[PDB]
Structure formats: structure tokens, C-alpha cells
Amino acid sequence: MEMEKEFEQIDKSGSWAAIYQDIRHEASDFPSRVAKLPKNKNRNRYRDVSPFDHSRIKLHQEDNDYINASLIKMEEAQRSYILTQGPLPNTVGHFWEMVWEQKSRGVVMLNRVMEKGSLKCAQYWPQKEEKEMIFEDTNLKLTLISEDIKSYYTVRQLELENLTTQETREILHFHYTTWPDFGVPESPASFLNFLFKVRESGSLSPEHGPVVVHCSAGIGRSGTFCLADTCLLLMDKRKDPSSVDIKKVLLEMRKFRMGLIQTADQLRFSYLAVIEGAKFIM
Ligand SMILES: CC[C@H](C)c1ccc(NS(C)(=O)=O)cc1
């Protein structure tokens, strides 16, 4: 079926939970043996969210190459994304090592450091220009260059230096600051505006490594971001845009990381975002 009328048909029939459970039943199951090794317990935020072995990002390190991060490679759309958990106190250095080694330009953050009164990720970037951060375990230096605070999101320019080679690179930090503590946003308008700002920066383009996107577990809000982006790109590429099937795209993405889209409300919000976004593109 088309999207916008399939949408109204699920609303009127109140069957979002059944649709979402079907997706959970059909989703791929691949091994995640490296994630479960005892030496990696303090590298995982949640025991039930792990990268598959076949798509995990490997650190270029002979001691321990593990990070909780997955490469989502979308062949028809010609887009790739790295989805990862919010960094932990003992993985901030690994996080920036990955950004460096994978040649990423942008980092997309969809959570606040504290939500619901608890810490959802480490404070992993510097908050003042004159107070830079040094990650001694991976030999990197990170400096805040500039910060632009808007009503729904903040953009930061960062400098990452590999202290071993003295090479430097500019990284863009795109921080969506207004996702509500419970539920999903009432309108997709600010989320779509944010997606377009990431696009306009070059951070999603083939001349760079894959964008790094995270929330707390790296599957819920993060899944919504890449699912909406990929669906809108396919609607531009194809002769028949109504042939884009959001449930099939989501199942394809779940071949690369488990659990993408965590609730039936997030599924409905993804439909809403793609529907409204397809009108603005034209
Ligand atoms: C950190 C704010 C600074 C003013 C800034 C730099 C870059 C961009 N975007 S871009 C994609 O490079 O055009 C936006 C803002």
C-alpha cells in the first residue's frame, strides 16, 4: 500500500502495536559473540543491546578492537551510517578513535546527557574553548572551536587532533536537544528541519566516512533518524515514489543492527516524518 493512506488505515483501526510486533517477529537474528566476551562487559551500556559480529565497527588496535557500534550500509540509497550507544566513562577515548579511523565528518546526538534524572551518556566533548580534552588511552586531543545554540538544536565545530601524527580534522557536532523525556514529538517539523541541517553540512555525503549517530542505546531515536533519511532519499531517486515501503526499509536496516525503532510510537512518528517530509522536498 501507499504510505499516507496505510497510515490513516492503521490509525483508524488502532493496530500500531500489532504492526510493530510483526516487525519484531520478522527481524534478523545474527550472532554478537564479541560483544558478550567477559572482557567487554564495561564497554556495553545495556546487556540486551549489542552489535552483530558481521557489521560491527572494529577499532584499529591489537589489544581489544571492540566498540558497541554498527555499520548500516544501504545499497540502493547509496548511504551509510554508523549507529552507536552514548559513550561511557571508559569508552570516550574509543568513541573518538572510531570517528578518526572511519574518516567521519559529523556526529549526530539525539539525547541529553541527563534525562529522567539519570545519566544517559558521558560528557564526551568540551564545553569551553579554553578547556580542551585529552584522551590519553587513544592519544587524541579535542577542542571546541565554536557553538551555535538554536531553539531546537545546537551545532558545534570541533577540532580533533591525532597526537601521534599531529594531523588535525574539523568535526561537526549536531545535537538535537528537545526530544521529550517520554514519548515522541507531537510534530515532526523540528526533527525534519534538523535532518536537513545535517544534510546541508556535507556530513552525510560520499566524500566523507559514514556519519556517527547516537542516542543512549543507539537503536531508538537513532533508528528514526536513519530510517527517515533513507526513505526520503529513495523517494527522490525512484520513478515511482509511492513504491517506497517503510516497513521493508526498516527490516533491511535491522539486518545490520538489532532493535531499531523501540516502540510502536516511534514507528508511527517515523511514518509521520517521511509523509510530511515528502511534501516539503517538492
Ligand atoms: C558551530 C557553529 C558554526 C557557526 C557552524 C559551522 C558549520 C556549520 N554548518 S556547515 C555544514 O559547515 O555549513 C554551521 C555552523
* Ligand 1 within 6 A of CB of 177: no
> How many A from CA of 16 to the centre of ligand 1?
38
| Alpha carbon distances (Å) from 211 to 99, 104, 109, 247 | 9, 6, 11, 23
Residues 161-187, buried b or exposed e (16+ Cβ, 10 A)? bbeeeeeeeebbbbbbeebeeeebbee
Q: Strands 168-176, 106-109: parallel, antiparallel or unpaired by DSSP?
A: parallel
Instruction: Report residue 133: phi and psi, to 5°.
Output: -120, 140
List of residues 6+ apart from 73 with CB closer than 8 A: 55, 80, 256
Ligand 1, atom 9, lies closest to the CA of 201
Other C-beta atoms within 10 Å of 254: how many?
Answer: 23
Residues 101-134, buried b or exposed e (16+ Cβ, 10 A)? bbebbbbbbbbbeebeeeebbeebbbeeeeeebe
Give dist(CA 105, CA 95) in Å, integer. 14
Other C-beta atoms within 10 Å of 232: how many?
Answer: 23
Give which of 247, 256, 229 is closest to 28, Cα–Cα: 256
Count, residues in the chain: 282
Q: Which atom of ligand 1 is nearest to the CA of 147?
A: 1
* Ligand 1 within 6 A of CB of 155: yes
* Ligand 1 within 6 A of CB of 105: no
Q: What is the 3-state secondary structure (H, E, C) of the chain?
A: CCHHHHHHHHHHHCCHHHHHHHHHHHCCCCCCCCCCCHHHHHHCCCCCCCCCHHHEEECCCCCCCEEEEEEEEECCCCEEEEEECCCCCCCHHHHHHHHHHCCECEEEECCCCEECCEECCCCCCCCCCCCCEEECCCCEEEEEEEEEECCCEEEEEEEEEECCCCCEEEEEEEEECCCCCCCCCCCCHHHHHHHHHHHHCCCCCCCCECEEEECCCCCCHHHHHHHHHHHHHHHHHCCCHHHCCHHHHHHHHCCCCCCCCCCHHHHHHHHHHHHHHHHHHC
Helix axes 189-200, 221-237, angle to 10 degrees: 70
Q: Which atom of ligand 1 is nearest to the CA of 155?
A: 1
> How many A from CA of 40 to the centre of ligand 1?
36
* Ligand 1 within 6 A of CB of 175: no
Q: Strands 118-119, 114-115: parallel, antiparallel or unpaired by DSSP?
A: antiparallel
Q: How were these coordinates obtained?
A: X-ray
Ligand 1, atom 14, lies closest to the CA of 155
Q: Give residue limits of the domains in the chain.
A: 1-282
* Ligand 1 within 6 A of CB of 201: yes
Give which of 219, 192, 186 is closest to 111, Cα–Cα: 219
Q: Are 194 and 152 in contact (CB under 8 A)?
A: yes
Answer yes or no: is 262 a known binding residue: yes
> How many A from CA of 168 to the centre of ligand 1?
17
Give dist(CA 103, CA 203) in Å, integer. 11
* Ligand 1 within 6 A of CB of 156: yes
Instruction: Report residue 159: phi and psi, to 5°.
Output: -110, 125
Resolution of the experimental model, in Å, one decimal: 1.8
Q: Are 150 and 193 in contact (CB under 8 A)?
A: no
Instruction: Report residue 237: phi and psi, to 5°.
Output: -80, -35
Give which of 247, 271, 80 is closest to 191, Cα–Cα: 271
| Alpha carbon distances (Å) from 225 to 9, 59, 80, 263, 278 | 24, 24, 12, 14, 15
Answer yes or no: is 102 a known binding residue: no
Exactly one of 121, 215, 226, 231 is catalytic; which is it?
215
Give which of 83, 79, 121 is closest to 230, Cα–Cα: 79
Residue 147, Cα to own-chain centre: how many angstroms? 21
Virtual torsion, Cα 224, 228, 230, 231, nearest 10 deg: 130
- Tell me the residue type at 25: H
Assigned CATH topology for domain 1-282: Protein-Tyrosine Phosphatase; Chain A (3.90.190)
Task: Specify whether 215 is catalytic.
Answer: yes
> How many A from CA of 97 to the centre of ligand 1?
23
Residue with cell 584522551: 135
| Alpha carbon distances (Å) from 127 to 131, 137, 173 | 8, 21, 12
Other C-beta atoms within 10 Å of 216: how many?
Answer: 21
